[PDB]
Enzyme design. Structure first.
Site, short mmCIF file in Angstrom:
data_model
loop_
_atom_site.label_atom_id
_atom_site.label_comp_id
_atom_site.label_asym_id
_atom_site.label_seq_id
_atom_site.Cartn_x
_atom_site.Cartn_y
_atom_site.Cartn_z
N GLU B 38 83.25 -4.33 36.34
CA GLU B 38 83.42 -5.77 36.46
C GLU B 38 82.14 -6.44 35.98
O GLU B 38 81.12 -6.42 36.67
CB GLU B 38 83.75 -6.15 37.90
N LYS B 127 90.27 -9.98 46.26
CA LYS B 127 88.91 -9.61 46.60
C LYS B 127 88.53 -10.22 47.94
O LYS B 127 88.86 -11.37 48.24
CB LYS B 127 87.91 -10.07 45.54
#
Lengths: 135, 201
Positions: B38, B127
């Site tokens: 990421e 998340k």
């Protein structure tokens, strides 16, 4: 005959007649240049004969053949740690853990190579991985 | 995709300072066996880092863009070639934006209400930021009322508790400094030391 000479080398390995066993494995390698078993055995024999530079070469030829023995990578770590290539040995102990993250020995012995190489943080993380496994 | 999070189980929340610094650390992480990387957008010109790591999509890595605050930042992220968009906060504009381009979006959530509003937008994979505040008791408490939401925490995940998160029910975990801090060879070692610790719980 390719097998029979490996079996001879194992029997000679049982009688501590180590250098004669190394002669047998090598004749089984002439018989079949790809008997990766004869390669791995020859490495652990030379490691005890203390031909450590020639030993690491056979271990590398064995890993080249069957690329996924955690046995072979862990054993190449012992040779490269004794020989002095302490960072080339930590890379080998790494490949061995990439293949079996339950190997209690390979984790303990990576934290020992790292404790001598500098990074106590990286080593302390490896030490606790090994203690996590076996009782 | 979702399965790709349950397979590789770890996401490298990669933050850096320069573009050359970021390319190094992603290469190190990937050699360490971590395939979900990421690339946060606090890295200057991150829309170019993600297009300059495009060769690792052949080697089997999923490169995505993280910490995305504006939807116009999300434009540069999609056009770069990111394969998932991550944000520390729930921004419904970015969710519309990502649904319609056909990109996976993972919004930032901390409360039950923040999760319901993100669920009404279709998401079932969130998340959980910052994990060092909510904790695994949160994930285990949401197991009941919302048995569909799967979590990927970030911040508060180290190898002393990485099994705690998983045995509470998370889908994967993102690790920031405790995986990327260090020399581009230290980082490869931190990855195999972390991908092995996960493979144990």
């Amino acid at each position: 005959s390719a097998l029979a000479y490996v079996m001879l080398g194992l029997l000679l390995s049982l009688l501590n007649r180590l250098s004669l066993a190394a002669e047998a494995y090598k004749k089984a390698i002439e018989l079949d240049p790809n008997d990766a078993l004869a390669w791995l055995l020859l490495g652990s024999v030379l490691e005890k004969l203390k031909r450590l530079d020639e030993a690491a070469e056979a271990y590398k030829k064995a890993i080249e053949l069957k690329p996924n023995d955690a046995s072979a990578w862990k054993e190449l770590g012992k040779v490269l740690e004794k020989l002095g290539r302490l960072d080339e040995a930590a890379k080998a102990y790494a490949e061995a853990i990439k293949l079996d993250p339950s190997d209690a020995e390979a984790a303990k012995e990576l934290g020992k190579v790292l404790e001598k190489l500098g990074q106590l943080e990286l080593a302390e993380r490896a030490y606790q991985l090994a203690i996590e496994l076996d009782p | 995709m979702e399965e790709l999070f349950k397979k590789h189980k770890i996401v490298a929340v990669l933050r850096a300072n320069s573009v050359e610094e970021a390319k190094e650390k992603a290469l190190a992480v990937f050699r360490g066996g971590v395939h979900l990387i990421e690339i946060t957008f606090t890295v200057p010109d991150a829309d170019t880092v993600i297009k300059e790591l495009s060769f690792l999509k052949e080697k089997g890595a999923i490169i995505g863009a993280g910490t995305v605050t504006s939807l116009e930042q999300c434009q540069k992220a999609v056009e770069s070639g990111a394969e998932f968009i991550v944000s520390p906060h729930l921004d419904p504009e970015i969710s519309k934006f990502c649904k319609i381009n056909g990109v996976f979006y993972m919004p930032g959530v901390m409360t039950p209400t923040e999760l319901v509003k993100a669920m009404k937008l279709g998401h079932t994979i969130l998340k959980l930021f910052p994990g060092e505040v909510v904790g695994p008791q949160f994930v285990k408490a949401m197991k009941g009322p919302f048995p569909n939401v799967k979590f990927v925490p970030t911040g508060g995940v180290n190898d002393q508790n990485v099994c705690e998160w998983f045995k509470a029910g998370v889908l994967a975990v993102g690790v920031g400094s405790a995986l990327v801090k260090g020399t581009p060879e230290q980082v490869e070692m931190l990855a195999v030391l972390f991908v092995a610790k996960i493979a144990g719980c």
